Motif scaffolding. Structure first.
Motif, PDB file in Angstrom:
ATOM      1  N   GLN A  69      21.212  41.349  32.670  1.00 49.84           N
ATOM      2  CA  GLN A  69      21.348  42.290  31.625  1.00 49.84           C
ATOM      3  C   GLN A  69      20.384  42.048  30.489  1.00 49.84           C
ATOM      4  O   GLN A  69      19.583  42.902  30.093  1.00 49.84           O
ATOM      5  CB  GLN A  69      22.709  42.516  31.113  1.00 49.84           C
ATOM      6  CG  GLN A  69      23.022  43.542  30.163  1.00 49.84           C
ATOM      7  CD  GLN A  69      24.340  43.570  29.514  1.00 49.84           C
ATOM      8  OE1 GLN A  69      25.285  43.014  30.073  1.00 49.84           O
ATOM      9  NE2 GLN A  69      24.446  44.126  28.417  1.00 49.84           N
ATOM     10  N   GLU A  70      20.447  40.834  29.938  1.00 48.81           N
ATOM     11  CA  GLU A  70      19.668  40.540  28.737  1.00 48.81           C
ATOM     12  C   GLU A  70      18.172  40.575  29.018  1.00 48.81           C
ATOM     13  O   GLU A  70      17.394  41.039  28.173  1.00 48.81           O
ATOM     14  CB  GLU A  70      20.090  39.189  28.152  1.00 48.81           C
ATOM     15  CG  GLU A  70      19.622  37.955  28.912  1.00 48.81           C
ATOM     16  CD  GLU A  70      20.476  37.652  30.130  1.00 48.81           C
ATOM     17  OE1 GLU A  70      21.392  38.444  30.429  1.00 48.81           O
ATOM     18  OE2 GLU A  70      20.226  36.618  30.786  1.00 48.81           O
ATOM     19  N   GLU A  73      17.101  44.278  29.092  1.00 52.42           N
ATOM     20  CA  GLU A  73      17.141  44.751  27.762  1.00 52.42           C
ATOM     21  C   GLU A  73      15.915  44.347  26.988  1.00 52.42           C
ATOM     22  O   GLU A  73      15.269  45.145  26.301  1.00 52.42           O
ATOM     23  CB  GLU A  73      18.409  44.511  27.056  1.00 52.42           C
ATOM     24  CG  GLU A  73      19.689  44.933  27.562  1.00 52.42           C
ATOM     25  CD  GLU A  73      20.904  44.146  27.266  1.00 52.42           C
ATOM     26  OE1 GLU A  73      20.720  42.985  26.850  1.00 52.42           O
ATOM     27  OE2 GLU A  73      22.042  44.646  27.399  1.00 52.42           O
ATOM     28  N   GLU A  74      15.536  43.114  27.042  1.00 55.98           N
ATOM     29  CA  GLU A  74      14.405  42.562  26.403  1.00 55.98           C
ATOM     30  C   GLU A  74      13.120  43.158  26.921  1.00 55.98           C
ATOM     31  O   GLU A  74      12.165  43.422  26.181  1.00 55.98           O
ATOM     32  CB  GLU A  74      14.325  41.099  26.313  1.00 55.98           C
ATOM     33  CG  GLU A  74      13.383  40.502  25.412  1.00 55.98           C
ATOM     34  CD  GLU A  74      11.972  40.427  25.838  1.00 55.98           C
ATOM     35  OE1 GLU A  74      11.742  40.665  27.041  1.00 55.98           O
ATOM     36  OE2 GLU A  74      11.074  40.148  25.016  1.00 55.98           O
TER      37      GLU A  74
END
Ligand SMILES: Nc1ncnc2c1ncn2[C@@H]1O[C@H](COP(=O)(O)OP(=O)(O)OP(=O)(O)O)[C@@H](O)[C@H]1O
Ligand SMILES: Nc1ncnc2c1ncn2[C@@H]1O[C@H](COP(=O)(O)OP(=O)(O)OP(=O)(O)O)[C@@H](O)[C@H]1O
Ligand SMILES: [Mg+2]
Ligand SMILES: [Mg+2]
Lengths: 233, 246, 198, 97, 49, 212, 148, 84, 49, 49
Positions: free
Chosen positions: F50-51, F54-55
């Motif tokens: 996820q992260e 997103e990044e």
């Protein structure tokens, strides 16, 4: 200013073209399969040709951009280059760097390799459009071009009575047919350049030195027996 | 006039070669033997002595000639043997000075297959002494003893007029080689080393090299300073002023 | 894992933008200094990156880069109109030798409008606007409007660069060669281009 | 048209046969073999244009018989002449059979 | 020119090292009166440039 | 050390981008598709990295967002590198009705399978039929031809919502389909019991929704 | 059981070959000749007739082997001449049935150097018919023509 | 692969077997002897290429010569035989 | 891949890297039993998520 | 792992006193469940289950 810079650039370009033309002649009539000649094609890019002409003859139309002391010369060159061919974009890089790029003469030249194949004229050398042997031969040609150029470059930093050694390799030389090997020997001999070639015995060139190798096991260890022959011819 | 020549190539304690010297021809030298005999090994020795840089040295197989880096193994470790190994060249300049240049090789112990390399050069050797004799002791055993660099330095320093130079960086080694006319260009920096190695290895495997073809102008044209330095000096007053303002 | 140079390439700040552009179908010529240099440097890895999408990254022999989708493309495809290829082949013709002396690389909308009307056949012009049309002023006005529209589409493709002002005057880039004819030994470009336009 | 044909010559195979038969004695008696002398004696039996091939084949047959123990001494061998017109050979004497 | 011949040539040409080669030297004769802006000692040589 | 992935990129991000699922997903996401719990492969993938995603997408000036219902989607910023578009009011009518249908426990016994006719019947039951007909044709007054035209427009918009991932047709029957939780975005104007104007202002400020 | 075998390979209007038929051997068949003679071209024709999938076919040089290059040109187009071309195989099945597989190849007019392929198969052909003659028409005095 | 398809295939068909090798000259005589015996024991057909005739006593061989001729090219093929 | 690797000869990088996929065949009896467990494990995944 | 999943609680609890097999390990493979390090893509490989 102006014209004199154009003249030094033009003379440098002219000298490079002439030297290339001299190197080019040594490679005429080299037979590699259906290839019969090799060239280094040198040309001048248009976007720079017009710039060089403008800097030569229309300087009174742009002198405002050159004598403005708020910006330096290389910056002036970059700004003039953007004024011509306005569609050119600049990648957020300093105009100083683009200026120094315009100062380097090599950037004005376009370089290609061409071969005179069979019934056809001069074609650009593409690997996928050649047989195996033709590719190997063309590679050797370009390599000797590089070596000659480098020797001409460095001689101004070397002693007057020094001539460097020249040597090149070829692995799995069995891939070349007798005619091609004769051509390659002729080239290297005319260029005073040494060769070391490896082949699984399929080829027996009469000139030069030959070494026979055989690997064996002796006292439970691997050992290579070597024999040499030379002087024939 | 009278271009220089490579005279001989010597291997000591390599895989399959305890002590072997090849007398190179003035025009053509042909290596011949069945598969796996050791031909490519000799060329590996030549080039490694010529360019002792472990970042560039990569002896990939002839099949798969053009692929990526792939494995972490550079293919050199397996060609050595336990102990100390050497590779040396013998050269004759246009001046007819005999110079011997080479490197000392050793397998670094560990899980991985790594190698240690040290260049050196000798000048003024008499024409009567061969490299194999310098590097081995004829002890009572059936087979001689290869002697390390300490013994070699002691042995050479004893000679009259012979100089032994041992290098700490590749740059110095290439500088000396150029000054003596063993190579056509003095390898200023790592980029120059990379291009020179590109030339050699492209010749070794054969074919129209992709890398040479991409950067053709970078290889065939010398760089000219005259066009530039005038404008660097004229530009200097503005550069200093701008930096001061910032 | 991932190849080191590929990771370096796509880590570069220029990648997102170029990605966006390329996916749109834009062609990168020698004009875009930084983008073109970036592609030259990292081609060997970008080709592999886009092959994962069933899309081909091609460098034309003239020098410009562009993407070609396969039948199994992962990127949604779209297709140009007939009038679009007509105008493209016209622009390829205008990339002529006397062009240099005629316009110094800078054309106008009227040049293209009049060339299109003069060189094409009436039947395909009617097919472009509408079959019910017949040599009427409103039809010509609609055809002018459509010409401006398709010219803007081509500007999106990077074929043609508008000079930065509201007026419709432009310059033609080398990438227009994509519309061009096949070249055979010794054949004259004008003749072959006209032969296809006919 | 219909395919034609062309045939090979077996002269070199015959040459190999004579040489191997002539050389077998050295192994059977385990007699030390010197390439210099053997090549000089054997080249006298053929004309000059064929010498190179004879030398190659003879070396191919000879190396299969034992090894030369001198190779581990660190002492290079000399280039022995084997005929006029200036042909040379380099090899240590074969001792270990 | 190489470093070995550089001192020889510099001694040979002396003050004239930085002269100009001009193959006729009569075509300058009309231009010459105009030279008010030049080094105090200008050297000219005739030969194929 | 040099020539080491960490110099240029986090290992987990490179590991994600090298996965075989990424190109599909990327392509889809850019096209506006919403990702729910049913397409396990994709969903799981999303969850795992996820992260990093997103990044990554942040580079583009776009937010990779996760709704409370567990579905992922892309929301572009004003400075977006990727174009942004808005849905039609008919799409909204069908969207809010699909939302009420998902909630309805009265029809939960169907196991999620609904028919276009049932959707149409529910829609006409709630909205102003004759006033809504104005969007199909400016002259509509309840004629059957116009009623069939409305049904065909509904059929078309519903097909667009399928491409967005908001509804899945049955494998062999196209007159029947199943809902997914992604439809709850149509309730973004009422999920909190507060002043509608303030909610609307908040949404436009966040880039979720535009007026017409 | 008797395993099937490839009897022969036929080329029509390839680069350097007008109409040539190689008769294969039961165990080994060798091709010899100087550089550029056309050996690799024969290999390429065979494999093309075996797997006509144009997405896969990619004829790199023997040098640069193993390098995934994505080259602009797959290298097949140049091996064909203008007009129509063929490449066919004759096979004897384990059931002792003669079957002729092959493809019709043709260059595509246009700037892109593209190629067209149409496979075909023939069964029951009499043993006396040679593919070289089946694919050509005798026009004029021993000056045959190829037929689409 | 042949063993896998034993179920699907009809009982009476054994599929054809064929492989290639370009630049066979890279192999020495012993290696080629090994390769030939391997392939013949497996009823495997081979097609190999080399500038020079590396296999004189096995199978069939063809010799190719290219001639430039009236501003185009033509290939001449002739067979070779082990003994004469 | 098989034919091309044979043509250029040598240890093909792609073949060795995925040797399982090329040599080991697939079995339908395994699938028929695993269908039930596949349903079960899918369901468990659902729940987990 | 096949032994862990195959043999169930009631009968094999007397077998489970060995240090290598326990029930919780099936959930411990949840960590391995999320993403194995597969490289080349064809057909559909996904996870330990
Ligand atoms: N890195 C290595 N590790 C282990 N064995 C090696 C290594 N490099 C070479 N060998 C072995 O050393 C022997 C000689 O190899 P080499 O490549 O020198 O052969 P060659 O004579 O050049 O063969 P060919 O010309 O057929 O390629 C062979 O047995 C090879 O297997
Ligand atoms: N795509 C192509 N376009 C143009 N000419 C080509 C193309 N492919 C091959 N040729 C030419 O066709 C001739 C035959 O090449 P080919 O590789 O088949 O020969 P070969 O006998 O196998 O050679 P080698 O053994 O050196 O590989 C050569 O002149 C080659 O240059
Ligand atoms: Mg080798
Ligand atoms: Mg070939």
């Amino acid at each position: 200013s102006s014209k004199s810079v154009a003249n030094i650039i033009r003379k440098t370009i002219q000298r490079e073209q002439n030297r290339i033309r001299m190197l080019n002649q040594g490679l005429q009539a080299v037979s590699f399969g259906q290839v019969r000649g090799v060239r280094l094609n040198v040309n001048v890019r248009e976007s720079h040709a017009i710039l060089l002409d403008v800097l030569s003859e229309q300087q009174e139309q742009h002198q405002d951009l050159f004598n403005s002391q708020r910006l330096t010369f290389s910056e002036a060159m970059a700004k003039l280059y953007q004024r011509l061919n306005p569609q050119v974009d600049m990648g957020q890089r300093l105009p100083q760097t683009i200026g120094e790029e315009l100062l380097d003469y090599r950037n004005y030249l376009e370089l290609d390799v061409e071969v005179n194949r069979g019934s056809d004229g001069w074609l650009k050398a593409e690997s996928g459009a050649l047989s195996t042997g033709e590719a190997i031969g063309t590679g050797m040609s370009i390599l000797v071009m590089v070596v000659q150029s480098w020797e001409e470059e460095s001689r101004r930093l070397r002693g007057k009575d020094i001539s460097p050694c020249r040597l090149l390799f070829l692995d799995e030389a069995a891939r070349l047919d007798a005619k091609s090997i004769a051509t390659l020997f002729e080239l290297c001999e005319r260029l005073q350049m040494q060769l070391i070639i490896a082949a699984p015995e399929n080829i027996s060139p009469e000139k030069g030195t030959t070494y026979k190798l055989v690997r064996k096991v002796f006292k439970n260890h691997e050992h290579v027996h070597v024999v040499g022959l030379r002087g024939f011819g | 006039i009278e271009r220089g020549k490579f005279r001989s190539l010597t291997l000591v304690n390599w895989n399959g070669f305890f002590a072997r010297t090849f007398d190179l021809d003035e025009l053509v030298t042909t290596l011949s033997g069945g598969n796996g005999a050791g031909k490519s090994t000799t060329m590996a020795a030549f080039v490694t002595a010529l360019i002792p840089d472990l970042t560039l040295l990569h002896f990939r197989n002839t099949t798969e000639a053009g692929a990526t880096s792939g494995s972490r193994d550079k293919g050199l470790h397996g060609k050595l043997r336990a102990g100390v190994c050497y590779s040396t060249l013998d050269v004759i300049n246009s001046r007819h000075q005999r110079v011997v240049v080479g490197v000392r090789l050793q397998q670094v112990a560990g899980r991985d297959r790594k190698v240690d390399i040290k260049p050196f050069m000798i000048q003024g050797l008499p024409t009567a002494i061969q490299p194999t004799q310098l590097l081995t002791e004829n002890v009572g055993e059936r087979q001689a003893r290869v002697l390390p660099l300490n013994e070699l330095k002691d042995r050479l320093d004893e000679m009259e007029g012979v100089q032994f130079k041992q290098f700490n960086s590749i740059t110095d080694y290439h500088a000396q080689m150029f000054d003596l006319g063993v190579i056509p260009k003095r390898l200023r920096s790592a980029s120059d080393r990379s291009k020179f190695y590109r030339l050699i290895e492209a010749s070794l495997y054969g074919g129209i090299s992709s890398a040479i073809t991409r950067s053709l102008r970078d290889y065939l044209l010398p760089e000219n300073s005259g066009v530039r330095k005038a404008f660097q000096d004229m530009e200097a007053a503005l550069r200093e002023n701008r930096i001061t303002l910032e | 894992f991932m190849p080191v140079k590929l990771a370096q390439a796509l880590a570069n700040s220029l990648f997102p933008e170029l990605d966006s552009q390329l996916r749109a179908g834009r062609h990168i010529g020698i004009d875009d200094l930084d983008n073109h240099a970036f592609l030259m440097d990292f081609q060997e890895q970008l080709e592999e990156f886009y092959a994962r999408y069933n899309v081909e990254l091609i460098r034309a022999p003239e020098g410009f880069f562009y993407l070609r989708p396969r039948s199994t493309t992962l990127i949604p495809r779209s297709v140009l109109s007939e009038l679009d290829m007509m105008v493209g082949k016209i622009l390829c013709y205008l990339y002529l030798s006397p062009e240099r002396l005629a316009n110094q690389g800078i054309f106008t909308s009227q040049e293209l409008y009049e060339e299109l009307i003069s060189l094409a056949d009436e039947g395909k012009l009617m097919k472009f606007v509408n079959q019910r049309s017949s040599g009427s002023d409103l039809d010509k006005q609609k055809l002018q409007e459509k010409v401006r529209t398709t010219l803007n589409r081509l500007r999106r493709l990077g074929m043609v660069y508008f000079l930065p002002n509201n007026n419709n005057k432009f310059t033609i880039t080398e990438a227009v060669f994509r519309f061009g004819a096949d070249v055979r030994s010794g054949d004259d470009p004008r003749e072959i281009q006209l032969r296809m336009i006919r | 048209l219909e395919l034609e044909y062309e045939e090979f010559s077996e002269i070199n195979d015959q040459l190999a046969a004579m040489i191997e038969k002539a050389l077998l004695v050295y192994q059977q008696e385990q007699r030390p073999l010197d390439l210099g002398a053997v090549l000089r004696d054997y080249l006298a039996q053929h004309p000059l244009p064929r010498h190179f091939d004879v030398a190659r084949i003879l070396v191919d047959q000879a190396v299969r018989l034992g090894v030369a123990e001198a190779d581990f001494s660190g002492l290079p061998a000399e280039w022995l002449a084997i005929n006029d017109y200036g042909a040379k050979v380099q090899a240590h004497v074969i001792d270990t059979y | 020119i190489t470093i070995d011949d550089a001192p020889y040539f510099s001694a040979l040409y002396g003050p004239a090292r930085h002269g100009i080669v001009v193959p006729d030297l009569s075509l300058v004769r009309p231009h010459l009166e105009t030279l008010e802006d030049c080094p105090e000692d200008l050297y000219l040589i005739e030969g194929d440039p």
